[PDB]
Design a protein around this ligand. Sequence first.
Ligand SMILES: CCCCCCCC/C=C/CCCCCCCC(=O)O[C@@H](COC(=O)CCCCCCCCCCCCCCC)COP(=O)([O-])OCC[N+](C)(C)C
Ligand SMILES: CCCCCCCC/C=C\CCCCCCCC(=O)O[C@@H](COC(=O)CCCCCCCCCCCCCCC)COP(=O)([O-])OCC[N+](C)(C)C
Ligand SMILES: CCCCCCCC/C=C\CCCCCCCC(=O)O[C@@H](COC(=O)CCCCCCCCCCCCCCC)COP(=O)([O-])OCC[N+](C)(C)C
Ligand SMILES: CCCCCCCC/C=C\CCCCCCCC(=O)O[C@@H](COC(=O)CCCCCCCCCCCCCCC)COP(=O)([O-])OCC[N+](C)(C)C
Ligand SMILES: CC(C)CCC[C@@H](C)[C@H]1CC[C@H]2[C@@H]3CC=C4C[C@@H](O)CC[C@]4(C)[C@H]3CC[C@]12C
Ligand SMILES: CC(C)CCC[C@@H](C)[C@H]1CC[C@H]2[C@@H]3CC=C4C[C@@H](O)CC[C@]4(C)[C@H]3CC[C@]12C
Lengths: 96, 96, 58
Amino acid sequence: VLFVIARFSPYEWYNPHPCNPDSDVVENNFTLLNSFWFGVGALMQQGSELMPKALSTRIVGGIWWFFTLIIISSYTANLAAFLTVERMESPIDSAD
Amino acid sequence: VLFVIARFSPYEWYNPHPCNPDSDVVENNFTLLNSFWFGVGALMQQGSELMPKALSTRIVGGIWWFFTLIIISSYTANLAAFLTVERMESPIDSAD
Amino acid sequence: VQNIGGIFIVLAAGLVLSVFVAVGEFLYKSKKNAQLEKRSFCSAMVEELRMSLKCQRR
Ligand SMILES: CCCCCCCC/C=C/CCCCCCCC(=O)O[C@@H](COC(=O)CCCCCCCCCCCCCCC)COP(=O)([O-])OCC[N+](C)(C)C
Ligand SMILES: CCCCCCCC/C=C\CCCCCCCC(=O)O[C@@H](COC(=O)CCCCCCCCCCCCCCC)COP(=O)([O-])OCC[N+](C)(C)C
Ligand SMILES: CCCCCCCC/C=C\CCCCCCCC(=O)O[C@@H](COC(=O)CCCCCCCCCCCCCCC)COP(=O)([O-])OCC[N+](C)(C)C
Ligand SMILES: CCCCCCCC/C=C\CCCCCCCC(=O)O[C@@H](COC(=O)CCCCCCCCCCCCCCC)COP(=O)([O-])OCC[N+](C)(C)C
Ligand SMILES: CC(C)CCC[C@@H](C)[C@H]1CC[C@H]2[C@@H]3CC=C4C[C@@H](O)CC[C@]4(C)[C@H]3CC[C@]12C
Ligand SMILES: CC(C)CCC[C@@H](C)[C@H]1CC[C@H]2[C@@H]3CC=C4C[C@@H](O)CC[C@]4(C)[C@H]3CC[C@]12C
């Protein structure tokens, strides 16, 4: 859905073209390969070279950041508990 | 491994040159000294300026982010136990 | 799911709130460029030909 908006939003189409913009340049940096890399790159707390423009893509980047802020924060809370070893269950548990 | 793949992948070869090369200025910015810095820069949760472009190097960038996510999260969750030092507990407390 | 739960709710509601900003970015653009170039309803469909293109363009 980030790729759907970034191929529909008429502000993501930007000219790189840094010298002096003439005409016939603009092109999205959000290919469908790239939009997973913002999704994985934000989920792993590391960030990408991709940073959205164009507020409709900012809100997707805004809500996915607050999504992955809580999931990583909830993962580190219980992780202190689950790093305890369990000794082996006995091969018998009853008279049978 | 990231240096092996980046020289072997035909898509990390890019011409940087934002204004009309017209023949050949194609570069492969991952050196050795850049490849360690992406590894160290993701281990320390800071992130480098260098980002993988080919999908041949995204999975190396993807798994190493997930590796250093679990290392740092298991580090912080365990270090709460070791700074909160359980005190001296000589195993006699009462007459019972 | 019973005790995380709502972070998927705000993620679902956030993407619903986003796509109405996307048509808000579309209509604010389609009313601005149609002052001199083309007409009101048609120039929206002109940019639909742009967005449905599977290639890079101008
Ligand atoms: C977990 C995994 C699940 C699966 C993953 C998900 C699915 C995998 C996605 C696969 C496709 C997406 C990969 C990137 C694009 C492919 C480029 C390429 O192969 O080389 C091409 C270079 O030509 C180009 O690069 C043109 C750029 C196209 C726009 C890029 C985004 C649109 C993809 C929209 C994707 C569909 C969305 C709906 C349709 C809009 C070579 O050109 P070609 O081979 O001859 O192709 C015909 C030429 N044409 C296109 C120029 C006419
Ligand atoms: C020089 C280099 C080193 C050497 C070379 C290495 C060669 C060999 C090294 C390793 C290979 C062999 C390992 C030995 C054990 C096998 C594991 C196994 O048993 O099955 C496991 C399956 O678990 C998995 O499936 C793990 C793989 C996850 C999929 C990763 C995809 C990521 C792609 C996404 C990337 C997105 C990118 C984002 C950008 C778009 C589970 O079973 P088990 O519990 O482990 O079994 C234990 C037995 N027991 C049951 C009695 C306890
Ligand atoms: C925070 C956001 C990160 C998102 C990543 C999510 C990744 C997918 C997540 C989860 C996918 C699988 C979930 C099952 C795991 C349950 C434990 C288990 O079964 O271990 C058992 C064997 O081990 C296995 O059988 C697991 C085999 C796959 C291991 C690798 C998964 C990570 C993929 C790598 C890709 C890296 C990331 C890709 C992108 C770079 C051990 O035995 P047991 O414990 O006694 O049995 C209990 C089984 N039970 C609990 C099911 C009842
Ligand atoms: C890709 C497109 C999406 C595709 C799928 C579409 C799916 C549509 C999805 C969701 C659409 C909305 C419908 C569900 C929400 C209310 C109903 C409900 O479930 O009740 C819930 C609470 O109810 C509340 O408390 C609601 C409070 C508002 C929070 C939701 C919006 C966030 C606010 C703005 C932030 C974002 C916007 C701004 C962002 C910057 C249930 O809670 P409970 O019952 O009290 O207790 C649990 C008991 N139980 C476990 C048995 C249940
Ligand atoms: C956000 C979208 C794009 C992907 C995820 C799908 C969402 C909408 C779905 C997938 C799993 C779903 C949950 C599955 C189980 C329950 C428990 C039930 O007692 C209340 C609803 C609740 C809490 C569901 C809410 C909606 C839910 C979170
Ligand atoms: C729900 C809607 C009506 C409210 C939000 C308005 C949105 C769709 C529009 C109204 C005016 C627009 C802005 C007008 C001008 C610019 C400058 C340009 O260089 C980047 C985009 C930017 C910053 C636009 C972003 C989107 C924008 C803020």
